[PDB]
Design a protein around this ligand. Structure first.
Ligand SMILES: Nc1nc2c(ncn2[C@@H]2O[C@H](COP(=O)(O)OP(=O)(O)OP(=O)(O)O)[C@@H](O)[C@H]2O)c(=O)[nH]1
Ligand code: NA
Ligand code: NA
Length: 422
């Protein structure tokens, strides 16, 4: 026993993303998400299901909590996806009143549910638990404010356990006008309390789905969120299946986090289709991952890589994985103080994601964070300098001075990344 991870999904986006993640996890372990059973004894593969799944005598269950301040997103998702025996009622922590897209309301109102959440965690968490994943969006009020409160609470209550955030940034034109306030307040909180923040945005996700998968239409968020689920599953694959070179959550964080503040990570995966997986080389896939077309955050260019983690899954030639490292270092821009021999951390897992031949997942700590975050700051200043939309933050405990304090700490992070860039 050990290695276990508990996943907290927060707000509408966090819980919708949770559907795709748990669908992927059950498929990889050949668990039927509707019966809670193995699909077959014969195709049960050598694995370590306990990382994300609790095996009880009646079947398997997610080690998860489904948290929101209003009930519709979760209730509708569970009905539509026929999840009622897997996303069961004892794992749901729901209120009724909503955060109304204000981080401060999500934070304040979420505080009332913290005792219930901690009791649920302490009820079912094994003592060997390696850490927590928090899945949430940053632009609304619940994922952002309650997700921030949860990051702070878990770091304080469970010292020694990793706290990792999978966090969706606002789109290139925000679809919540309050998103700059909510994103700055969340990223300030995560800079204080998270161990590692893996970022995504919907502009990049839409571009990948339209240009790499060529889907004719995106009708439901499931047809975007599967990409976030793919990153979460693949970076933990070596905890769950055999392979030559395994890595755990804090092993990856320690290789990425050069300075304590540089904990904001851009993910990418290649290829996106089974057909591409069968007609590609290790070099080709790694080059795709380092190309902005495949980054899951909308970036103007390749930036400068400070440190990266690459997970190679499936039918991988180890000699090609190693031989291409000098090519990665010569063709991808790294930050100026990165030695020619450094900046890569490898994991290699024998299990390919379902139906592909092989797949590469990249987590990159990249100075281009500074451009992404400066745009957020520019949006924040456009509202704050006019005192627009501040009233409901002030009424829920975030003074105008506190908004400014969060902004200025956010700016200090931006500057640290820009300094490393040169
Ligand atoms: N990728 C992705 N983005 C989502 C999803 N659901 C909402 N979003 C984005 O999340 C932001 C809106 O936040 P929500 O997650 O709906 O809000 P919430 O966290 O429930 O907060 P409140 O509604 O204010 O209580 C917008 O930027 C949406 O585009 C989702 O399922 N997937
Ligand atoms: Na919501
Ligand atoms: Na909403």
């Amino acid at each position: 026993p050990g290695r276990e991870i508990l996943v907290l999904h927060v707000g509408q986006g966090g819980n919708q993303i949770g559907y795709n993640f748990w669908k992927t996890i059950c498929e990889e372990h050949n668990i039927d998400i509707r019966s809670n059973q193995r699909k077959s004894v014969e195709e049960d593969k050598v694995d370590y299901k306990s990382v994300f799944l609790v095996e009880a005598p009646d079947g398997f269950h997610p080690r998860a909590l489904f948290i929101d301040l209003e009930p519709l997103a979760v209730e509708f998702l569970v009905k539509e996806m026929k999840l009622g025996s897997f996303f069961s009622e004892d794992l749901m922590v729901l209120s009724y009143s909503g955060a109304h897209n204000v981080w401060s309301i999500g934070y304040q109102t979420g505080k009332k549910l913290i005792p219930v959440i901690l009791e649920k965690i302490r009820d079912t968490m094994p003592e060997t638990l390696q850490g927590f994943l928090i899945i949430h969006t940053l632009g609304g009020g619940t994922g952002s404010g309650f997700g921030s409160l949860l990051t702070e609470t878990l770091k304080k209550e469970f010292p020694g356990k990793g706290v990792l955030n999978f966090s969706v940034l606002p789109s290139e034109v925000n679809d919540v006008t309050l998103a700059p306030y909510n994103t700055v307040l969340s990223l300030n909180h995560l800079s204080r309390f998270s161990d590692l923040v893996v970022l995504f945005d919907n502009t990049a996700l839409i571009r990948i789905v339209k240009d790499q998968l060529n889907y004719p239409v995106i009708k439901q968020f499931s047809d975007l969120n599967f990409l976030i689920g793919r990153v979460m599953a693949s970076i933990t694959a070596s905890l769950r299946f055999p392979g030559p070179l395994n890595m755990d959550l804090m092993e990856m964080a320690h290789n990425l986090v050069a300075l304590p503040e540089t904990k904001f990570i851009i993910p990418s995966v290649a290829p996106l289709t089974k057909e591409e997986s069968e007609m590609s080389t290790e070099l080709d896939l790694v080059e795709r991952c380092f190309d902005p077309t495949h980054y899951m955050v909308n970036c103007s260019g390749q930036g400068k890589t400070i440190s990266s983690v690459l997970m190679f899954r499936g039918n991988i030639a180890i000699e090609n994985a190693f031989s291409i490292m000098t090519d990665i270092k010569s063709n991808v821009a790294f930050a100026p103080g990165v030695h020619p021999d450094l900046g890569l951390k490898y994991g290699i897992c024998e299990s390919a994601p379902v139906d592909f031949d092989k797949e590469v997942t990249l987590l990159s700590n990249n100075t281009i964070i500074s451009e992404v975050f400066n745009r957020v700051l520019e949006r924040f200043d456009s509202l704050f300098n006019r005192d627009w939309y501040t009233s409901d933050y002030v009424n829920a405990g975030t003074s105008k001075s506190n908004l400014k304090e969060a902004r200025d700490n956010f700016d200090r992070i931006i500057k640290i990344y820009k300094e490393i860039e040169g």
